[PDB]
Amino acid sequence: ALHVPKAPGFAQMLKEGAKHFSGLEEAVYRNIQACKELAQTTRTAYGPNGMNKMVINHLEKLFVTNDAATILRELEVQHPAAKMIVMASHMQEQEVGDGTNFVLVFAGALLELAEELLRIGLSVSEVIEGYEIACRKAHEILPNLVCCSAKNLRDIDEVSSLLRTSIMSKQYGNEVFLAKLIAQACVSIFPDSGHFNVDNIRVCKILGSGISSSSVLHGMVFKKETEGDVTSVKDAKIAVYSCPFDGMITETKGTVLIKTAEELMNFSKGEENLMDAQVKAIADTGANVVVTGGKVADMALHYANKYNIMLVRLNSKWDLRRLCKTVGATALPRLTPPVLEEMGHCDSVYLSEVGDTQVVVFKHEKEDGAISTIVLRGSTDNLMDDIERAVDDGVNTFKVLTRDKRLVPGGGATEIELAKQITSYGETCPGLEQYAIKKFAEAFEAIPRALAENSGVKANEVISKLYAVHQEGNKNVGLDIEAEVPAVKDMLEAGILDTYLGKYWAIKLATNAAVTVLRVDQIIMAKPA
Amino acid sequence: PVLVLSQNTKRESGRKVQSGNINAAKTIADIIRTCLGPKSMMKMLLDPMGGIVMTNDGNAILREIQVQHPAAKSMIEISRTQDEEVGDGTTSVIILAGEMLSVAEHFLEQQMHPTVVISAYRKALDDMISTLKKISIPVDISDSDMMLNIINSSITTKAISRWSSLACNIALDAVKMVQFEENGRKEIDIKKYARVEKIPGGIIEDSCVLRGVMINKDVTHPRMRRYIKNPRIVLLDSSLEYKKGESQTDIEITREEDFTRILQMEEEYIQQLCEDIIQLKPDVVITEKGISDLAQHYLMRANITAIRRVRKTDNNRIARACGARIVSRPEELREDDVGTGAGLLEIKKIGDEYFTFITDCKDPKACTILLRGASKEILSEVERNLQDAMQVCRNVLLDPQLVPGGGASEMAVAHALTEKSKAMTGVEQWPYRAVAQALEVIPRTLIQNCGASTIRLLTSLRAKHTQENCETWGVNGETGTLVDMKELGIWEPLAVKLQTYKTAVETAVLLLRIDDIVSGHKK
Amino acid sequence: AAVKTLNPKAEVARAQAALAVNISAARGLQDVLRTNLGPKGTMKMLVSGAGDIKLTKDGNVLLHEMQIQHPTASLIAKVATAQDDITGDGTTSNVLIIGELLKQADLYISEGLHPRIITEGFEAAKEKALQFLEEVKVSREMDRETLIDVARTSLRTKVHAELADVLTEAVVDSILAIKKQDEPIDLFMIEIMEMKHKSETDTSLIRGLVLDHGARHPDMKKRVEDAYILTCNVSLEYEKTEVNSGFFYKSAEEREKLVKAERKFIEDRVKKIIELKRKVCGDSDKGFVVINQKGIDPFSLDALSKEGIVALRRAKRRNMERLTLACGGVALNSFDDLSPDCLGHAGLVYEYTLGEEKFTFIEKCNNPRSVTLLIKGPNKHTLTQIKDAVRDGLRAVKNAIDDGCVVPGAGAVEVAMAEALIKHKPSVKGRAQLGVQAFADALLIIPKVLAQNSGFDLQETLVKIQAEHSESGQLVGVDLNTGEPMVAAEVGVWDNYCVKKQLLHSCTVIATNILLVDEIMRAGM
């Protein structure tokens, strides 16, 4: 009697390296513990006082950021329930662009409180019922917590004040500069129609100087050089070709069949005369700049130099398309001269040297266009990548405001008001659902708690102050990070605001992820290949 | 090292080799001894391909097991031989061969020479053949009831016994439709022209033999009809695509119009092929090779339904069923080559797959048995049982002589041989009488697998077979009692039992002649 | 043993050992799958060797995903796979009834009864149960309400209740749309597209088509209102000659002429399309959308954009038929003589970008005999789960239409069939009455497991239900919220007659064959 044998049935028929977990203890509680560990890995990065993390992935690439979704992507999350919470966070990133850390924090809190409720004696079904009804109540409530609205997205000061909050959590020290830049870019590329595309905001990261030397450019920048002798143009007449800058050849095998010394003597002269004719037709359309998506031939380059045309070679097709959008041109698959409509224009096209890097700039002078570039300067590539992520946050906030212009107070004010109202709803709801409603409410407290802990103050006093002020009636009051002691202030009057849609989607996705993790009861992992 | 033969060359010789061969053979026998009769039990074999074979068939079992003893190899080979020749008796042969070797072990231990034993065995085999042919009875193969009873007496020992009437009628219909004569040569080819398609799901009671064929195919283009009530059918071995030439047909273009002219020439070639087809006014076109989309266009314009890439065997069955003739050059297409005789072409969804039926044929010389059931394994066993049933029907239609089952034939032959042995005065009387009593193993095994008393029942049966008109008396494998086969109805084909006895006796002869095993040597 | 004397590395389970092995594996599978049964069942999470997640309550998916290497388990997995391929539902119940038949038969075989006698009783009970099933089946006019009850009974077992209330209407409307009176339902004509952006309750039925690709030319419109749809299977890209050709020229001018000429063949088809477009749309009022099963090179894309045509390339061979049934045109493999009668109409065509993917919606068709279910959800595993659930629901409604009958659920038919078998037992000759009793006690595993999963006492619940069915004769089952008997036909809990019949047949057959196995053998070495 010195060995316990596998029980007859599934335990014996299970494969060698496979695992099977069943029940509250082996499955539910272990999943909740994993999600809790995940939320703890990302909690200290939440908010303006949130700290950065230095993640090294399996490829030894370095990420310095406090962006939750980025940290999650670069982590090797291997527990399946944590993977599910990460999927929720990435869905938040896809739908909204900001709020991934809210999703993580809130999901982890819901799951911890769900474990506590299961221990006190509620069933996963009742917990899920209460969580769903409380998410519905939160969605019913949030529209009433909306405090302000944008009222204009063509301005540059209002848009900066609106994007500052989203670009403050990331890059707290320097946020007025970044909000100015991102507002300039967003309103440059904002068309008279209410549709806004975030891919039309381009970001060029050039080593050298620092974040205060960054700038916006109404146009495009390419870390390229020019193929020919011309480097500058002041009234660009750009002609864009998706084809190479070479003589067209057959898609079927072509052979030069010579049968006479005369044909042999004349073939190459005829080729160059053909090239000269092609490029001269292009130059005579007025084009002073040619942009080819393919290669350039030496003879064609020769004749472009002869006829004073700036030649640019863009390897990428997305780059070619975006340049076409920028200049108002059409990519021609043939080397035929462009018509007056197929041509593009720029107030200037020139080659410059930003730092060590050489760049070709298609710059409009007008304060508008279809594409704008943000040239990010910085002393480190990692710093510039973090600032690009902050730019992405600001741009996605602008898009969220184009979709829905409503705003809720930040710094935990909406979360505290939600917690209060949902607690008041659970106190009226009889039956075992009230426990889960009240825990769903208490989960919101995790947001101001995380903000306070990262601010460097006592979260319990901060939360007590917030509850007291929201009981006295102020729904726009949240915590003040610019205070060494626990403090609170009017989030609206301070200008710290979140997006109604951001909160909506974050709450929905966090609740759905928690509820799925709870709905799991048995786990049958396979042998890790 | 100075060897004469290579190391790894191991040579055994003598009575150790003889007894080893006999034990290996009788071990092969004990493996499947319980798989004989109506009350047998299934065995679940595990293939090297992760598969499973749940069966009662001796040859299936022995073919799925692997051995290294050459005597066991020979026994597995004779099971294969019985299956290929008659398609029944695959375990009767194994058991009889094992018993013959067992009784020969005695005489070999008693200093008798294997050639003496073998000559006695051959005498006994000739006399067995004589006795079977004397006790056999004829059959009116036009009597469908007699034929169905013959097929039932062969499938009762198999899993399909629960659906005996269904399976019997299926097998009889399939074989009677595959019966074919051309140029004075009768041919029942139930291997090329009676096809079993197993579609899991459904219920076995809806399994049927079609008056036509079935393939797993859909129309090439969904604008084509899926239901046609008098289809004129054309079969092709050639691609309706434009393929290259056998020679180095390289082209050389210098003019502008030539490229387009060449591509249009390809299109015109497809048009001309399709017109060579349309000129016969078919409804369906079935190809073993591809059909280009332009060819599909032209056929659809002609209101023709096409099926693209069928197997040669399926095409041959469609030929036999609908009365068509496979062609390879639509220019050489004739009305005699067009297929009239099919009564309905349907393409219906069975589950989530599209199956093409060419059923309702008149005088179809080919068929498809559509099996439906719980799983591929159950249907594999049903298919094997149906192979048994059809092979028995075939053996009867070829040689209409019947012999009684339940061991009645074995006991009659054993009695006749014992009666003939009393005139034998030499030393072979003993092995001769021994194989006679070694035929008794069939009723012995039947009684054992039924669960009755072998001693008492076999004694009563051996005594019954000493009376005059009792050569039909045998045993039930279902109750453990002696009955008249004239009253029970278990009648085996004389061809089957002849092949069984012959294979058994010759396998015994081979393993008796064998001595002095050698091994190791590499080809 | 015998086999091990010839093949020394051979594995063998004998008469007692093979039955124990098979029954043990069957009961192990039954123990795993018992929890899947019913809407109160539990969802299992399944993690591949790569780390992929599956959330499922489906018996077949669970079987194929569990990590098992047992021969009996393979047999039962295959029977369940056939159940799923033919009926779409019944896999969990299949496994449960198989396990319970084997267990109830072992109950009598351990006391020395022969498995042959148990299987004879199985055959008698199968006959009587099929009779009783045909008797209790409800032949009903398949109205939208009945079909909704059926699809609900399936989707509520497979997913959450609110998502089930959405998928129910989606599935029922899709089937009621692609179905022609007295014409077998081709489920291929219901496309199933997954989008990974919104909530799971956004899953909808598009009365049209959704292609998982869009136009590859940027100047092509992203929205078309009154669109002529051209469904084609004609290459619009450069085609090389079958026979090896090659170009031979003596001058760059000749090379240029050959470059212009080599495309004339496909330019001609582009012009045919463009001329049809001009003849049917004399202005920019209506729209023209080409949907090609084959490729379209950039030159052709430019030529069609210039004329205002939206061209999608490399569509699906099934989308050819789906588009001709939704829009109403003719799918073409050649433009030899194309006419406006070859075109379909869609009252709206537009494009939807989702990250790196594009979608094309073709909606506002007149009476589309082909539709699509757009599975929206926040996670890949949510989408997979809803795909499985909608498969089940589509099969359920299709089966309810095919079988104009419908059978009460909640273990009602099993309770009633058990009572009928027990009343039939005396008419059975010999100790096959014990096989009949085993069949009945096996049929009773469905209500038992339903109670076990709702959190009730199996014996108490079953006694209540059997008492109500004997006193009243009404077909009563388990109420999963009170544990009391309830009339399934009155509360709208329906099962598929085909599913129940397939269960009876296949379970009886596989259980019989397993009970009659007397040797498991691996000797292929």
Ligand SMILES: Nc1ncnc2c1ncn2[C@@H]1O[C@H](COP(=O)(O)OP(=O)(O)O)[C@@H](O)[C@H]1O
């Ligand atoms: N100046 C500020 N004072 C207080 N809270 C702030 C301030 N700026 C941002 N926040 C809060 O930080 C939270 C978001 O921080 P972040 O780390 O970006 O999380 P998420 O990834 O969820 O957007 C929000 O609750 C927001 O209100």
Ligand SMILES: Nc1ncnc2c1ncn2[C@@H]1O[C@H](COP(=O)(O)OP(=O)(O)O)[C@@H](O)[C@H]1O
């Ligand atoms: N109802 C029956 N009663 C007694 N013997 C039977 C019965 N049916 C068939 N048999 C006998 O069983 C033998 C066939 O058994 P089977 O398992 O088919 O072995 P095989 O066909 O490989 O010889 C024959 O001797 C046949 O006469």
Ligand SMILES: Nc1ncnc2c1ncn2[C@@H]1O[C@H](COP(=O)(O)OP(=O)(O)O)[C@@H](O)[C@H]1O
């Ligand atoms: N609302 C309900 N109340 C009671 N029983 C139900 C209900 N819905 C479904 N059932 C029953 O639960 C059983 C199992 O469902 P499920 O596991 O999805 O079927 P399967 O066994 O075919 O996989 C079915 O027999 C069904 O009749």
Ligand SMILES: [Mg+2]
């Ligand atoms: Mg943020």
Ligand SMILES: [Mg+2]
């Ligand atoms: Mg046989």
Ligand SMILES: [Mg+2]
């Ligand atoms: Mg179901």
